[PDB]
């Protein structure tokens, strides 16, 4: 029964993400380039095209 | 029947199908062999290189298979040996006579 | 797949911006790939046919065996005749087809079998021939198998 | 044609890789026939305990 | 056939002819040349073997313009060539942004390739007795 | 009939040498290539 995982919409974890770039770096610095804690992969794989 | 401690051994040398390294120089004393007067940049940008690499490393992986042992490579679905052997209780004993 | 991204060989497969020659020159190296793929493929489909080529019960008709390849993207383009890949039985037939000399290996894993237990068919070879023609060669493997399925009770109950 | 380019450093490139990865395949041909043995020896020894 | 230390190899886009059965090769600067375009198009994880192979300038993607990024690109690019390219003496890098709204940042290195073999070359007349490290 | 003895006891299809599981050499791997080009 515990194997089964929990799957989520990504809009949590990047205000997540927005908090700790703004303490690092400032408001001015963009969110891209950092990584997600408690990710184990997206749910789909999307290519270059 | 207790458990035991679990370890890796540390000479990783077989000159073998299972040796990386092994298969890796061979590979390029035959390419020397067969066509140097053509082919002599051994370097590691080389995409000739890099696809003898892929191919050593496939290679290991097929022999690590059939190492397997026979209990499970010829195993059915179902479990038994049906197909397989016959068994003492039926190939050993004899008609009375 | 184990080859980098700028091989363009990959599943996420090359940028646009990189024009279609490059494009193509992929398509290229995955037909070339092939030729080593298609090979290590065979040695892995023969390991799963261990329990049916040393089987009591019954035996397969091929010696030899191979496998469709599918995680590869483009397959579908990359064959002639996409028919194959879905049976690799076909695919057998079209890509080793004669090289398996079926009656002679089929002959000797049977001999091999009928030895564990003792046994021996030698006579077969020119008795069936004052019944039998050509077709000899079908019949006599069909009784080896009976042979070996019925021989519980055969070397039993004398 | 083998034993003619057999150590003459004559061949395209596109075939060196291609008999060099045949001749590196030997060695598991050397492992995998050696199953019909295991196979035996299996039978006789862990099945009828002889 | 002075310049035979360079070497001669498969290029890197491979191409394969149907004129005559044979795949493209490429010899000395020509050979240099796509050596680096490998090079600076992978990552340093990703060759099997070779788990340290390739350069980390991904890492200043999403990053504003300035003297510390500037120092930082040179020493990641001056040390991929010494680990991975033994024909070649980096001359000069030249960074700069052209354009005010556009996300881009223009890197220009030069070059000079090496006339003596170096140590660390794998070209198969010479590195027998020629290659120490 | 002189019955049997020592030296007429060898089965010479028991040995699994006998057997040889996969038989290709480089030749036939070369006449696969070129069928499949």
């Known amino acids: 029964i515990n194997s089964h995982k929990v799957t989520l919409p990504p809009s949590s974890s990047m205000a997540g993400a927005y908090a700790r770039v703004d303490n690092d770096r400032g408001v001015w610095k963009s969110p891209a380039n950092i990584g997600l804690n408690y990710v184990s992969k997206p749910s789909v794989t999307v290519s270059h095209e | 029947t207790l458990n035991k401690h679990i370890s890796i051994p540390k000479d990783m040398s077989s000159k073998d199908d299972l040796d990386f390294h092994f298969l890796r120089e061979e590979g390029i004393r035959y390419i020397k062999e067969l066509g140097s007067n053509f082919w002599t940049d051994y370097n590691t940008h080389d995409p000739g290189i890099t696809m003898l690499e892929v191919l050593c490393y496939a290679i290991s992986d097929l022999g690590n298979r059939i190492n397997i042992p026979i209990e499970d490579l010829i195993a059915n679905e179902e479990g038994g040996v049906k197909g397989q052997f016959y068994k003492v209780q039926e190939i050993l004993p004899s008609a009375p006579t | 797949h184990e080859f980098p991204e700028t091989y363009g060989i990959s599943d996420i497969g090359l940028p646009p911006k ?140 004398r | 044609f083998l034993a003619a380019y057999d150590q003459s450093g004559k061949l395209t490139p596109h075939l060196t890789l291609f008999v060099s990865f045949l001749k590196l395949l030997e060695t598991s041909k050397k492992r995998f026939n050696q199953l019909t043995k295991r196979h035996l020896d299996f039978y006789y020894q862990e099945i009828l305990h002889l | 056939k002075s310049k035979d230390f360079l070497g001669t190899g498969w290029g890197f886009p491979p191409e394969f002819e149907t004129s005559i059965g044979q795949v493209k090769t490429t010899s000395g600067v020509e050979d240099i040349q796509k050596s680096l375009e490998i090079l600076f198009s992978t990552k340093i994880g990703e060759r099997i073997m070779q788990p340290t192979y390739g350069c980390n300038l991904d890492e200043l993607l999403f990053s ?70 | 009939r002189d019955g049997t003895g020592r030296r007429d006891l060898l089965d010479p299809k028991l040995a699994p040498e006998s057997v040889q599981l996969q038989d290709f050499e480089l030749s036939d791997w070369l006449i696969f290539a070129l069928n499949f080009a």
């Open chain 3, 18 to 157: 990189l024009g279609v020659k490059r494009a193509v020159l992929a398509r290229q190296l995955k037909g070339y790939l092939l030729f080593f793929d298609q090979i290590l493929a065979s040695y892995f489909e023969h390991l799963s046919k261990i329990k049916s080529l040393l089987s009591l019960d019954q035996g397969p008709s091929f010696t030899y065996f191979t496998q469709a390849i599918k995680d590869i993207k483009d397959v579908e383009e990359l064959f002639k005749d996409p028919t194959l890949l879905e049976n690799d039985e076909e695919l057998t037939k079209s890509l080793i087809g004669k090289l398996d000399d079926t009656i002679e290996r089929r002959n000797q894993l049977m001999d091999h079998l009928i030895a564990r237990f003792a046994e021996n068919f030698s006579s077969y070879a020119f008795l069936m021939k004052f019944l039998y023609g050509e077709s000899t060669d079908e019949i006599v493997l069909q009784d080896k198998q009976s042979f070996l399925r019925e021989y519980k009770e055969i070397s039993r109950e």
């Open chain 5, 64 to 133: 504003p313009i300035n003297r510390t990024l500037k120092t930082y690109v040179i020493e990641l690019i001056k040390n991929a060539i010494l680990y991975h390219e033994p024909r070649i003496d980096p001359e000069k890098i030249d960074i700069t942004q052209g354009n005010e709204i556009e996300g881009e940042l223009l890197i220009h290195l030069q070059y000079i390739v090496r006339a003596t073999n170096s140590r660390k070359n794998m070209v198969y007349p010479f590195y027998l007795e020629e290659g120490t490290n």
